[PDB]
Write a protein that binds this ligand. Structure first.
Ligand code: ATP
Ligand code: ATP
Lengths: 534, 16, 124
């Protein structure tokens, strides 16, 4: 038959591309399988083209060669890149027509009941580019494109040829060729998902399990969980790196290379190798989309008082409301407090606790030296990306630093303010939900600009006020002993205090530099001299 | 307006 | 080998084509000491190096240097010693009777380090 008798889906070793292969089989091979009588009754024509594209290392070449193997017909012809160009005039067309001459001859000799011929073009963009938009040094490229267009669909009709083309930049291809009759079906290959990442990891480990060379402590599901945004090539590279790390432990190089050969017949791969490789060898080519929450939360969170729990509960309530509402697709909230209170860390924690698919943080740390237009463009891009997902959450921190505010005159950038005021009231497309969390340290200034009314609610973040809270914080950090704690309490318990947690940490670190007989005193002075505040 | 810079060239050989 | 890694096409850097990516940077003090020892083996073997030269002092002093700069320093030090047995006043003449017993001293290294070689990194 036209299909190899032994062919089956499982044998080609493809990963998680179930839908795409099914679509190809539906839209490309349905007609050739039905009996000639009914297809003749419909009198419909047959597809002749396919255009695969996507990011590098997804499986395009693998899919093409597997399709070639699946079909029982003449050995596929392969055009390896720009091998068809020649210096002599008129010889490129000679090759481009020699490719199709055999199929033309067979179709002439047998007619409608002839076999099928398959031709594979690799790096099509190298050959075929827009005729008008091209170098003027030589018209060779235009003649080549015209010859290909004439041969594929000319006055003479040929109907027993299938052409496969793979590329990476589909835009450059000429429009005249991507029309029905030449290449109508156009797929897009993308990064796999967790299930695809599990299937891919399974396809390679098979032999090691078969020969009992893999330790039982390895959990493939966990590995698939950690490896986010990876591709098939990167997964295979990770496997190879773990294998090499395991193998390296039986060679004594660096003076002269030797192998044990008697302690080297009991080799096995543990989970430690995979963990080591995942941090040293392989990094995802596609930049990790997960935010680096460690940078924003550098010392965790400690429950030194009720306000922390109150703020977290309010954030959870807001998240629930935005998740389970339909009359109000857009919600906003503002966190305000005195400096050195830990607003950014709390906002980051609130964002993390939610499980929304899309989460991003916009900070001025990246916009150094930028003009007042670059900032607007960056914010627009971030919000455009957020609009795509069904549920989105965005965090804007250090608003006053984002407007370039200075109290002398005063001065600020108007364009950014207007853009923000417009983006705080633009609802997303139908059937989508968005949440915005803003952070600031000067509420009166925002009140003056008349943007405090643009938000929906406000949350207050206080700083340490009573000596008991200070003692609790010291206990949680545990940087002083009981004697020193009693000494400090004897003084602090009498009155009240006013200090932020970050400044408290800085003061502790500065104090610990003195000799043991002085540290406590060094601490007290620093609290007394700087502690003058309401 | 700055005049366009210089350009390279490509050559084609013919056989008699 | 390249000096501008970020200008190369990404499709060429995916696993399966060019996997092992390595960065070679400036050495630390131990690396400088090792490099300095490498380039002075022959002179020590042939007794052409004076006994007052301390390698560790040079390694400590030479900060922000690279391998090429260390080799250049050694080469300049070697020439400052060879120049004491030549006369380029009117006709270029060599002694050939004091050339034997040629030795390299610490003063040559010090002089070569203040007027000949200067690093191209950091503050000095
Ligand atoms: N879906 C997959 N299932 C199994 N192995 C895969 C898969 N994707 C990639 N691989 C592995 O990675 C290798 C790279 O895939 P392939 O050569 O098909 O990529 P490509 O998209 O044609 O490449 P490029 O765009 O860089 O030219 C495959 O040979 C196979 O080893
Ligand atoms: N309970 C806590 N709440 C908040 N931050 C805490 C807490 N415990 C420890 N921290 C740490 O305190 C540090 C100070 O937080 P952060 O730098 O976000 O403060 P901030 O108020 O935004 O500062 P700034 O006034 O400089 O804008 C952070 O590293 C955070 O990890």
């Amino acid at each position: 038959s036209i299909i190899n008798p032994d062919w089956n889906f499982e044998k080609m070793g493809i990963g998680g591309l179930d839908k795409e292969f099914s679509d190809i089989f539906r839209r490309a091979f349905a007609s050739r399988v039905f009996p000639p009588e009914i297809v003749e009754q419909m009198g419909c024509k047959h597809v002749k083209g396919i255009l695969l594209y996507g990011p590098p290392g997804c499986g395009k070449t693998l899919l093409a060669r597997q399709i070639g193997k699946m079909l029982n017909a003449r050995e596929p012809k392969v055009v390896n890149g720009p091998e068809i160009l020649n210096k002599y005039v008129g010889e490129s067309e000679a090759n481009i027509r020699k490719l199709f001459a055999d199929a033309e001859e067979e179709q002439r000799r047998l007619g409608a009941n002839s076999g099928l011929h398959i031709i594979i073009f690799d790096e099509i963009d190298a050959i075929c580019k827009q005729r008008g938009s091209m170098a003027g040094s030589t018209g060779v490229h235009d003649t080549v494109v015209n010859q290909l267009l004439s041969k594929i669909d000319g006055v003479e009709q040929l109907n027993n040829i299938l052409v496969i083309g793979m590329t990476n930049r589909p835009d450059l291809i000429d429009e005249a060729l991507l029309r029905p009759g030449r290449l109508e079906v156009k797929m897009e290959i993308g990064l796999p998902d967790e299930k695809g990442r599990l299937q891919i990891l399974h396809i390679h480990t098979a032999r090691m399990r078969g020969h009992q060379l893999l330790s039982a402590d390895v959990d493939i599901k966990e590995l698939a969980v950690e490896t986010k945004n990876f591709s098939g090539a990167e997964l295979e590279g990770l496997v190879r790196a773990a294998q090499s790390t395991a193998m390296n432990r039986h060679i004594k190089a660096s003076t002269k290379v030797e192998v044990d050969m008697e302690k080297a017949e009991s080799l096995q791969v543990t989970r430690g190798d995979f963990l080591a490789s995942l941090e040293n060898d392989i990094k995802p080519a596609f930049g990790t989309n997960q935010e680096d929450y460690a940078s924003y939360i550098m010392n965790g969170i400690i429950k030194w008082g009720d306000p922390v729990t109150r703020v977290l509960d309010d954030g959870e309530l807001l998240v629930q409301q935005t998740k389970n509402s339909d009359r109000t697709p857009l919600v906003s909230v503002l966190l305000e407090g005195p400096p050195h209170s830990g607003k950014t860390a709390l906002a980051a924690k609130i964002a993390e606790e939610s499980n929304f698919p899309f989460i991003k943080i916009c900070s001025p740390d990246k916009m150094i030296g930028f003009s007042e237009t670059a900032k607007c463009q960056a914010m627009k891009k971030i919000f455009d990306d957020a609009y795509k997902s069904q549920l989105s959450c965005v965090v804007v921190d250090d608003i006053e630093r984002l407007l370039d505010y200075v109290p002398i005159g005063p001065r600020f950038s108007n364009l950014v303010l207007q853009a923000l005021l417009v983006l705080l009231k633009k609802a997303p497309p139908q059937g989508r939900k968005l949440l915005i969390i803003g952070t600031t340290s000067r509420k009166d200034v925002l009140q003056e600009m008349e943007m405090l009314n643009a938000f929906s609610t406000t949350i207050h973040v206080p700083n340490i006020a009573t000596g008991e809270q200070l003692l609790e914080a010291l206990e949680l950090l545990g940087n002083f002993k009981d004697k020193e704690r009693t000494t400090i309490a004897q003084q602090v318990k009498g009155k009240k205090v006013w200090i932020g947690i970050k400044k408290l940490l800085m003061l502790i670190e500065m104090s610990l530099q003195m000799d043991p007989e002085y540290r406590v005193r060094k601490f007290l002075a620093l609290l007394r001299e700087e502690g003058a505040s309401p | 307006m700055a005049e366009d810079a210089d350009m390279r060239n490509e050559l084609e050989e013919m056989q008699r």
